[PDB]
RNA sequence: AGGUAGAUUACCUGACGUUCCCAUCUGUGUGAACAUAAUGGUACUGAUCAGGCUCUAAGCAUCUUUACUUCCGUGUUCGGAUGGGAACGGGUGUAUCCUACUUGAUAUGAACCUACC
């Protein structure tokens, strides 16, 4: 997932041109991004590509890809019911490795994939607005649990044996 | 300003009231003859004592209507395209096209030839 800020203005005689739209738009692509924006235009202000002209296109990397952050998402779904606004909370160190996490995570708790999710919005929370039963246990000071039944790590597939000689064990870790 | 012939055929229509008529137009007087009908009401013809009462025309109205624009609303619907989702029924996403009703604002005619004022 990449983020890339877009403006763009209309020119014809319904829209003045001076409006300026903005977006911060995530798609793996460029070109994606691009098509999500002018969805956006033509379904809220009736701005069409034909009518209208790009003017930035550049992407947005994060500031500090270091630090920890608890990232609150505010999307809406549709499923066969109807239409849902819901908020997910996820920890990352990128805003765009966490809407990677809610698209695979609302692709297998909620069976919707990609072409049925709008991201409304994407806020950096404080340490207790977490509100996730499994994220919450995970954002305190003393944090500490035990890796068990950990299967032992291969270096690389050079190692990789298909037949191995004595026994095999796990490890505590 | 008015009258004749018009073209556009409601921005020209319909209802409620208002304003002049100096010329013009209209309404207005009469029935002998052409002509007319059950009726000089119509149509016809002869005329000029009166009149802006109506017609016509100009304007009024939170007037119906009609005519442009926005909005409605990129919402209805739709052309193209899956080993897309659904047990069906039906309904996505993508590249596109995109009404209508309604409502609101404005308007209530423009314009040609001839004659007379």
Redesign the pocket.
């Given at each position: 997932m990449k983020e890339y800020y877009i403006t763009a203005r209309c020119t014809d005689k319904?829209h003045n041109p001076n409006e300026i739209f903005r977006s911060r738009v995530f798609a793996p692509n460029y070109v994606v991004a691009k098509?999500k924006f002018?969805?956006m235009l033509?379904?809220?202000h009736?701005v069409?590509?034909?009518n209208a002209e790009l003017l930035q296109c550049q992407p947005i990397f994060e500031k500090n890809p270091t630090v920890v952050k608890n990232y609150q998402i505010f999307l809406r779904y549709?499923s066969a019911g109807g239409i849902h606004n819901i908020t997910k909370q996820y920890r990352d160190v990128t805003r765009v490795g966490a809407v990677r996490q809610m698209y695979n995570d609302l692709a297998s708790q909620y069976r919707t994939?990609q072409?049925?999710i709008q991201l409304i919005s994407i806020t950096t929370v404080g340490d207790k607005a977490v509100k996730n039963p499994v994220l919450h246990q995970f954002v305190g000071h003393h944090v500490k649990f035990p890796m068990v039944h950990c299967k032992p790590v291969i270096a690389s597939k050079r190692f990789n044996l298909p037949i191995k000689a004595g026994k095999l064990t796990t490890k505590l870790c």
């Amino acid at each position: 997932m990449k983020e890339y800020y877009i403006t763009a203005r209309c020119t014809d005689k319904a829209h003045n041109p001076n409006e300026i739209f903005r977006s911060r738009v995530f798609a793996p692509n460029y070109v994606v991004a691009k098509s999500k924006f002018w969805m956006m235009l033509k379904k809220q202000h009736k701005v069409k590509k034909i009518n209208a002209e790009l003017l930035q296109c550049q992407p947005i990397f994060e500031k500090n890809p270091t630090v920890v952050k608890n990232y609150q998402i505010f999307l809406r779904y549709v499923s066969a019911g109807g239409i849902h606004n819901i908020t997910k909370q996820y920890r990352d160190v990128t805003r765009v490795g966490a809407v990677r996490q809610m698209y695979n995570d609302l692709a297998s708790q909620y069976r919707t994939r990609q072409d049925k999710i709008q991201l409304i919005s994407i806020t950096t929370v404080g340490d207790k607005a977490v509100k996730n039963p499994v994220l919450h246990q995970f954002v305190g000071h003393h944090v500490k649990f035990p890796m068990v039944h950990c299967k032992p790590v291969i270096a690389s597939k050079r190692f990789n044996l298909p037949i191995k000689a004595g026994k095999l064990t796990t490890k505590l870790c």
